[PDB]
Amino acid sequence: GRMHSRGKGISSSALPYKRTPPSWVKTAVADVDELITKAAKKGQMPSQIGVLLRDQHGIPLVKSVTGSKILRILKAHGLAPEIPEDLYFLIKKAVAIRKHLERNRKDKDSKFRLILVESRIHRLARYYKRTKKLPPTWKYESTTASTLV
Amino acid sequence: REGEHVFGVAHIFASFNDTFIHVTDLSGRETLVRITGGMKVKADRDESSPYAAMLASQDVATRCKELGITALHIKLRATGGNKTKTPGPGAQSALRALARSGMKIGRIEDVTPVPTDSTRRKGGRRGRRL
Amino acid sequence: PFTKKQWYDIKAPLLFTSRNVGKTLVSRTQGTKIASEGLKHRVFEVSLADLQNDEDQAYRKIRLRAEDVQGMNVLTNFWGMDFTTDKLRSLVRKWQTLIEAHVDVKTTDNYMLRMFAIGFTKRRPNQVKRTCYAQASQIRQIRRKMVEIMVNQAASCDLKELVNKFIPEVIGKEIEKATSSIFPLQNVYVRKVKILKAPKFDLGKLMEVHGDY
Amino acid sequence: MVLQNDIDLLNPPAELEKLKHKKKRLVQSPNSFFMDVKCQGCFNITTVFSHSQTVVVCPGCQTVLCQPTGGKARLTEGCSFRRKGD
Amino acid sequence: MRAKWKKKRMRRLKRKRRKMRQRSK
Amino acid sequence: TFKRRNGGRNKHGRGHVKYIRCSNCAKCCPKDKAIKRFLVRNIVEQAAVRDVQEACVHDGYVLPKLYAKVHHCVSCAIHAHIVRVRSRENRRNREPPQ
RNA sequence: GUGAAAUUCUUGGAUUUAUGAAAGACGAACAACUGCGAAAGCAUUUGCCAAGGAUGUUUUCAUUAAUCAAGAACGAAAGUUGGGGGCUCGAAGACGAUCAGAUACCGUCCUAGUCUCAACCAUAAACGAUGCCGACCAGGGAUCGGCGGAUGUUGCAGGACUCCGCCGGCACCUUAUGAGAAAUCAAAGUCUUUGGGUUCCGGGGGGAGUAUGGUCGCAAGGCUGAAACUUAAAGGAAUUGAC
Ligand SMILES: [K+]
Ligand SMILES: [Mg+2]
Ligand SMILES: [Mg+2]
Ligand SMILES: [Mg+2]
Ligand SMILES: [Mg+2]
Ligand SMILES: [Mg+2]
Ligand SMILES: [Mg+2]
Ligand SMILES: [Mg+2]
Ligand SMILES: [Mg+2]
Ligand SMILES: [Mg+2]
Ligand SMILES: [Mg+2]
Numbered sequence: 001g002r003m004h005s006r007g008k009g010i011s012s013s014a015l016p017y018k019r020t021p022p023s024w025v026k027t028a029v030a031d032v033d034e035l036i037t038k039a040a041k042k043g044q045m046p047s048q049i050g051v052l053l054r055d056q057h058g059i060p061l062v063k064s065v066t067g068s069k070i071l072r073i074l075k076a077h078g079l080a081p082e083i084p085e086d087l088y089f090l091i092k093k094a095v096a097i098r099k100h101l102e103r104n105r106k107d108k109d110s111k112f113r114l115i116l117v118e119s120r121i122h123r124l125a126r127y128y129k130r131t132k133k134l135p136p137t138w139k140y141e142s143t144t145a146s147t148l149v
Numbered sequence: 150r151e152g153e154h155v156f157g158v159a160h161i162f163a164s165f166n167d168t169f170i171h172v173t174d175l176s177g178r179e180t181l182v183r184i185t186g187g188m189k190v191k192a193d194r195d196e197s198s199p200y201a202a203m204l205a206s207q208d209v210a211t212r213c214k215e216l217g218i219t220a221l222h223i224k225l226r227a228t229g230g231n232k233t234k235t236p237g238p239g240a241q242s243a244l245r246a247l248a249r250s251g252m253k254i255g256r257i258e259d260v261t262p263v264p265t266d267s268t269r270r271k272g273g274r275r276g277r278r279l
Numbered sequence: 280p281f282t283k284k285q286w287y288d289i290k291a292p293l294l295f296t297s298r299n300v301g302k303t304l305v306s307r308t309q310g311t312k313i314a315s316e317g318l319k320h321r322v323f324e325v326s327l328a329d330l331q332n333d334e335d336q337a338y339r340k341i342r343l344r345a346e347d348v349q350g351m352n353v354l355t356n357f358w359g360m361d362f363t364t365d366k367l368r369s370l371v372r373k374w375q376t377l378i379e380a381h382v383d384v385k386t387t388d389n390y391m392l393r394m395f396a397i398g399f400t401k402r403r404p405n406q407v408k409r410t411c412y413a414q415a416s417q418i419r420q421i422r423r424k425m426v427e428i429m430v431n432q433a434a435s436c437d438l439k440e441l442v443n444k445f446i447p448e449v450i451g452k453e454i455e456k457a458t459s460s461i462f463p464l465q466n467v468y469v470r471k472v473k474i475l476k477a478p479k480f481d482l483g484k485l486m487e488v489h490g491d492y
Numbered sequence: 493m494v495l496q497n498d499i500d501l502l503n504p505p506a507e508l509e510k511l512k513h514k515k516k517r518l519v520q521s522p523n524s525f526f527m528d529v530k531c532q533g534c535f536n537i538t539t540v541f542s543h544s545q546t547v548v549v550c551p552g553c554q555t556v557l558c559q560p561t562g563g564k565a566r567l568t569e570g571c572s573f574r575r576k577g578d
Numbered sequence: 579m580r581a582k583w584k585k586k587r588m589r590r591l592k593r594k595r596r597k598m599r600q601r602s603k
Numbered sequence: 604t605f606k607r608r609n610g611g612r613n614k615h616g617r618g619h620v621k622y623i624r625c626s627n628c629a630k631c632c633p634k635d636k637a638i639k640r641f642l643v644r645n646i647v648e649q650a651a652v653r654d655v656q657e658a659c660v661h662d663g664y665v666l667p668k669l670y671a672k673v674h675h676c677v678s679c680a681i682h683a684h685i686v687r688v689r690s691r692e693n694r695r696n697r698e699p700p701q
Numbered sequence: 702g703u704g705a706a707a708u709u710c711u712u713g714g715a716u717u718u719a720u721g722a723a724a725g726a727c728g729a730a731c732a733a734c735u736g737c738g739a740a741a742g743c744a745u746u747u748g749c750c751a752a753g754g755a756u757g758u759u760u761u762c763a764u765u766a767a768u769c770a771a772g773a774a775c776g777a778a779a780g781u782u783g784g785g786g787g788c789u790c791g792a793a794g795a796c797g798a799u800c801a802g803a804u805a806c807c808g809u810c811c812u813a814g815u816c817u818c819a820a821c822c823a824u825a826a827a828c829g830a831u832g833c834c835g836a837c838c839a840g841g842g843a844u845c846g847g848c849g850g851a852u853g854u855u856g857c858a859g860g861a862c863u864c865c866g867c868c869g870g871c872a873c874c875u876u877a878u879g880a881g882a883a884a885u886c887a888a889a890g891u892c893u894u895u896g897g898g899u900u901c902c903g904g905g906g907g908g909a910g911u912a913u914g915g916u917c918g919c920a921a922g923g924c925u926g927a928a929a930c931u932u933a934a935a936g937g938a939a940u941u942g943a944c
Contacts, residue, residue, distance in 0.1 A: 058539035276630025
């Protein structure tokens with residue numbers, strides 16, 4: 001189930017068996033590449049770039065049309081963010097929780113959620129260190145974390 | 150005049166110990182006759198008995214004719230508040246005698262004071278053990 | 280009850296149908312107990328069935344206020360409108376949703392008053408569900424609709440029209456049919472009205488709503 | 493419906509899997525599709541996702557097509573819907 | 579004998595022993 | 604030995620429930636455990652309604668009802684015959700009488 | 702007020718009736734084999750602040766995971782240190798009553814407390830007396846949240862209602878072909894045909910959660926925790942009598 005809850009929900013996506021892009025997709029790889037690069041220039045991120053491609057531009061799956069994942073495309077183009085998206089959003093949420101909890105010292109339920117989110121942040125940072133996706137000297141400092149985001 | 154009814158208000162207050170028959174003006178700031186069940190009995194246990202309320206109701210009926218009170222609004226109530234809320238044993242007889250003793254009855258209402266959420270009831274957490 | 284005291288007769292406002300409302304007492308003149316000051320009882324509970332000679336509205340209660348004693352009469356005025364315990368206890372049923380709203384609207388005459396509305400969800404003609412509940416996110420919208428309709432029909436001319444829309448169900452029906460987009464909302468009307476503050480006697484505006492006595 | 497002893501798991505009925513959960517089917521398949529929404533006027537070729545999440549527009553008047561909801565995007569009454577497929 | 583009151587008696591004995599030991603250090 | 608599957612109360616999916624006080628002894632009992640009844644009766648009974656009918660000023664006055672939800676602890680409910688002791692097989696019968 | 706009485710209040714007006722102001726506590730009915738939360742726990746309206754499950758997804762990363770010594774957050778009620786508040790109720794105490802006796806059960810008046818703020822405590826029948834994660838194995842209907850479809854009514858696409866289906870949750874009913882000492886359990890099943898992973902923890906009954914040492918706490922106390930000696934039974938479930 002959930003790592004930090006008792007839920008057992010299974011809602012997710014189901015990729016089609018057909019790996020080839022659908023026939024009606026008449027967009028070349030160059031157009032998709034330019035769109036992804038422009039979005040990454042506009043401060044977007046892979047998760048919220050894939051949805052924009054899926055909805056507005058009718059691209060069901062980037063890995064099908066271009067043959068490679070969004071993060072790989074950005075890294076090859078060199079536009080990839082310095083911090084992975086999931087860790088960035090976890091750090092942002094922890095910063096917001098700390099900012100709220102600063103003025104509410106008796107809100108002893110957001111302190112527990114803060115402990116949970118910090119544990120998740122540390123686990124993800126350890127994983128990214130093991131695979132050399134972060135500098136080995138990286139460290140999550142709570143006081144200066146808000147400056148990062 | 151005759152036929153047309155002059156109205157008083159009977160604030161019957163029937164607890165488990167006494168029974169008050171109190172006739173007032175429509176405002177309630179006056180008082181015509183106020184007699185309890187304990188006036189008509191010589192033992193302070195029988196005050197709540199139906200017969201004591203019967204006697205007290207007879208007396209209120211006798212008093213309320215000379216001033217022209219030809220009909221009553223009955224406002225029956227019990228202890229209310231945080232204590233018991235059901236009317237006492239003498240609540241009915243006191244009403245019934247009013248009907249029997251040539252007295253007209255207007256609207257009948259229940260005005261037991263109910264709290265939306267009261268203070269702590271006495272007796273403790275384990276309750277009154279017998 | 281004494282050989283003293285005077286038998287005065289109350290006068291309900293002209294807005295109702297029958298003005299004669301029982302009889303009252305007061306000390307005649309003894310010492311400092313002035314009859315004029317002593318008759319400022321200022322509260323009379325009536326059923327509104329007598330004031331309209333119709334029996335189906337017996338569930339209501341009208342609180343009249345004695346304003347000026349003159350000509351052996353008392354010349355009352357509106358001071359509140361509440362419910363009997365019978366109707367309120369009959370309405371609240373299990374397997375149902377109770378929605379209560381209240382507002383502190385103000386009239387042009389500076390009569391600060393508080394209004395309360397009460398409503399209940401209604402089962403459909405073809406309903407197999409045995410509960411007929413509502414989600415809190417819906418009862419909140421119902422409460423907002425109640426409040427806005429209250430402040431819409433109020434915030435207008437003098438209280439004369441306000442009680443002209445109280446003895447009938449104008450606020451209640453309007454709330455009923457302005458919320459059918461959310462829930463059916465059966466049995467909707469004003470539970471009670473509390474007068475928070477009166478401007479002043481004003482010395483004469485009371486006679487504009489009274490007959491010749 | 494004694495049990496699966498009568499049906500064949502290899503070749504199950506073609507309509508019973510139209511109702512099971514997408515993950516729990518014999519082979520996982522999406523429940524969505526892509527549709528080319530046609531407006532009342534011209535510019536009728538815009539392609540949108542069934543379970544869309546962004547409020548798409550049109551070049552002409554921005555002609556708001558769909559609202560994202562908990563499920564299928566709420567297409568307007570004025571916009572006509574036809575679907576494209578593989 | 580109720581075990582609650584046995585526990586209470588044990589607590590009284592413990593505090594009395596502590597006082598006696600503090601008397602002589 | 605577990606006499607009842609639900610433990611004598613009606614608690615599932617929660618940890619705490621505020622109590623009430625028995626109407627006879629004022630003993631604190633959990634709200635779901637307490638024996639709750641809803642009694643609705645005429646203010647005046649059949650022997651009285653006849654004498655109050657003609658005594659009423661107008662014939663259109665309907666006689667008023669009274670409604671009361673009462674709660675009883677297990678001891679008071681059993682002693683007052685609100686609920687009796689049932690057999691082992693009839694204990695599971697949750698169907699109300701009639 | 703009581704089974705019955707008295708202690709107490711009262712012609713200086715007790716109890717009762719109507720109006721109004723203030724104070725503190727409490728949120729009836731609606732309220733459910735219903736909801737949320739890691740548990741403790743949470744029930745008037747409205748605004749703000751951050752958080753969360755489930756559902757939907759042809760979005761993204763790609764093993765990042767499960768359980769966990771040491772080490773940490775939170776933890777009813779009572780209790781402790783001060784400030785405020787102090788309605789009701791009420792340990793201690795006093796009095797009345799009952800009684801062979803009543804430091805109790807029953808009445809009345811009440812102190813700490815009950816409410817709140819800043820700190821301590823770390824225990825409950827903290828219970829589902831049932832650790833967490835994963836797979837499989839009977840049926841049924843109801844219900845809560847989300848979603849998909851059909852449907853034909855609403856003083857009104859959508860909302861309310863009806864029917865079918867999927868995921869997630871709290872439960873419930875019938876039945877073993879299962880298990881069990883049995884009560885009973887759809888998990889407490891898939892166990893001599895014994896092995897999915899992992900943490901904690903028990904070894905006849907007392908002495909005893911006691912002595913002592915260590916350690917946390919202002920204290921009350923908490924965590925860890927024996928031995929000598931004594932004993933043939935203690936105990937669980939069900940059965941027939943007796944009461
Ligand atoms: K019960
Ligand atoms: Mg709904
Ligand atoms: Mg037993
Ligand atoms: Mg839960
Ligand atoms: Mg508990
Ligand atoms: Mg409430
Ligand atoms: Mg609920
Ligand atoms: Mg530990
Ligand atoms: Mg323990
Ligand atoms: Mg549903
Ligand atoms: Mg042993």
